[PDB]
Amino acid sequence: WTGQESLSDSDPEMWELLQREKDRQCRGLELIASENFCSRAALEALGSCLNNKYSEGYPGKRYYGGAEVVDEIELLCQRRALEAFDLDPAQWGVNVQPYSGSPANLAVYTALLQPHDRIMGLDLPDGGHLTHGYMSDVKRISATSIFFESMPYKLNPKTGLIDYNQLALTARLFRPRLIIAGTSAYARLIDYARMREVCDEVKAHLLADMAHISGLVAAKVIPSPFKHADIVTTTTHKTLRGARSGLIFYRKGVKAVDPKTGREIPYTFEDRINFAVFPSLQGGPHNHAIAAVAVALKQACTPMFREYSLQVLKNARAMADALLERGYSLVSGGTDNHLVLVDLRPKGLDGARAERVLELVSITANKNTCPGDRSAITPGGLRLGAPALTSRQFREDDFRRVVDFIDEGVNIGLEVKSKTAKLQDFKSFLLKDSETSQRLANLRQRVEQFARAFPMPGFDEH
């Protein structure tokens, strides 16, 4: 044994599984708004010998040696991160060690809050992320709500927008020290200028969690949260098209000096952010991930990536219009980012039913809940994203053919619901009725045949 044998040679069972998953990604239409297809170059870094290096601490402030190179890689990732979001290294710093998106948020709270301090985030069913806070009426679900005290701010259920008015009202009473502006399932821009006002008033911290849209921000395709927020957190995947990791951006330097004499009240985020990440929460950095992120961050700095980003927007808008053209309704009234929220209720269908059907013809999205709604089993919509297919060089005509394939899916789904009862029947119906089965099998071929033709980032076979 050398540890240099190939995966296909030494673990064929696993190689088989990787090829299956690579086939599945190539042959399907990928509309889960959070997913993307990562470049071979980033993957090459991800599976590198950097996995072997323990480097607890930070560059030039490690606890043991051998860190000559990983130090330069960590700093390179920092600079590339600041460049990708056009930030002055004098006004902003960045931590690149968070293992994923969720860990990046937990470290922000730990750095800046005391246990049981108050947090406000967009409610889960209103398109928030779990890490922003969630309690059922019987259980604290998100650790954010075990260790801190969260209260959701809510969506105006008529405009599908963030009820900025209530939020200011709800917040002057609840008194959060932290408000989170960012989302999972929201199709419009966030008004960070107003968030910052509600925050400057209740004297809360403004945290932008830009996971879903971070690539749009780097490409300057939509407005930057860094204008208003003191802190920004993000996945490095999703629209950023990186490897799975996380980042924490914080304001550094002098904040203001209007009260105490004239002493430029420095921002105090940097030290607390970095200390919370390590030593408080995490262990050894994942240097292979840090390098892969640095590769993805470099790509995001280029003209090529802005072009990708615009195409993302175009393909979302084109996806919206394509749907509004067959009468579908869009909570929000369309989109202004990488995704569209489709209210399937007016067309007499739900988010759950659509998904199982779409998935069976190699189309993948996620059911989600819509304003109002009811049973969390049968949610009200489908979340649909561009970024993935856009990275396969998809174009508006291509997406319109996607909507057409989707529409034949819903139409199978609408037709399937008339002949069945509950969600258990509606799913067995899909796999059981030889007429609906045979119709699914064919619609699959058309979808697979059409998807395979496009290019796919990454390695060839895995």
Added chain:
Amino acid sequence: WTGQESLSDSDPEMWELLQREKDRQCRGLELIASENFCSRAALEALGSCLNNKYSEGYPGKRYYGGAEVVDEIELLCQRRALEAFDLDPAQWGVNVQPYSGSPANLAVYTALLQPHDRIMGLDLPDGGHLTHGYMSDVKRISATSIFFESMPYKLNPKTGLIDYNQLALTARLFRPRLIIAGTSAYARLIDYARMREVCDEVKAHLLADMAHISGLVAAKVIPSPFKHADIVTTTTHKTLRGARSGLIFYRKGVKAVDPKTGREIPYTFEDRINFAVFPSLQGGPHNHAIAAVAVALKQACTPMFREYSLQVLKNARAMADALLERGYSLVSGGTDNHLVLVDLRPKGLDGARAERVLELVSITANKNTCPGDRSAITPGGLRLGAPALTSRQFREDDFRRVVDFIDEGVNIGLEVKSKTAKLQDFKSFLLKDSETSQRLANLRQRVEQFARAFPMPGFDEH
């Protein structure tokens, strides 16, 4: 742009960094006890298109589709995990989603304890891990000590062994809800049975955190904590030789019968552990890491890996013996596992001076605290580990050579100490004194020539 370009073509700055680190790994004598060299087969899974797949949730219990293959992989990783540690699936369950070793522990605490519940672990200067709790006299440093209430137990400084009698005495008073058995810097086997009795008496859960020793446990070359612990966490790197990830093992099935009616008292770990990992703490799994882990786990079941782990024990003991023969002192006098703890105080040089000299001749170790140490800047010891070099097919005689080199570096460090005052004059002198830099360059070149000839797991260039 296809995202199919190679790293060396598309990011030469990063490619050059990878090559420098690869050269550093190939030419160094790597003795950091937490390090290993990951197999190419696992690394190929790590840098695969599994990075693209969002699969929030668990096999079959997902929140959206497209998980056909990812479900099989995670289920396969679970099986290989139970099998690597010879665990009855009726008696043991495993969660394979923790992003790393530290997340795995925080998930166990949140699963089983309420905020501010009490935890005891081995004191950090005594060789415990940060995630087991740590507070200075003025600051809560570990997140474990922020969200929970930690109190350490200690070594007997006379024997360098865990003082099980004082743990017992002290747990009866503190009444921990959870006691942690596991170490970062301990050369001896832990008395899990004794810990089990202490936990049974005070009604605490026993958590075995076997991160450092898990490879030895898998190979059955040392006793298994699964015989006595309720919960077992581990890293998947270190002696397991995998990519960086984590595991939580938990007992399941019938715990005991009711003294009165059969009743049946079941274990309640499975649901709480899995719920804490997700939705409470983490986001989407890192499926590329999960697959890489599955690869490392299968390797760990082979006769090859048992042989390797036996050699790790022999090599650590060879290193211990050769250190003793040269007049070094070892904390607790020797070793029964993969590492040895050197006490350099009797030879007149501290672990900080020694680590920096060793680093400049391409021998990487880490300074660490010895029983009765009073300075955090000048700890009196060095932790040395055998696993990384054993994976390069070092044998007992090679470790004897390694000790020869170490001894040379120590002697150099002694001389420089006699010509300098403070720690920072020592480190400067190593770089700026002509005769000293010469001595070091000669030793470094001999170390690197010796090291370069052994094989190296991984890819050829990065």
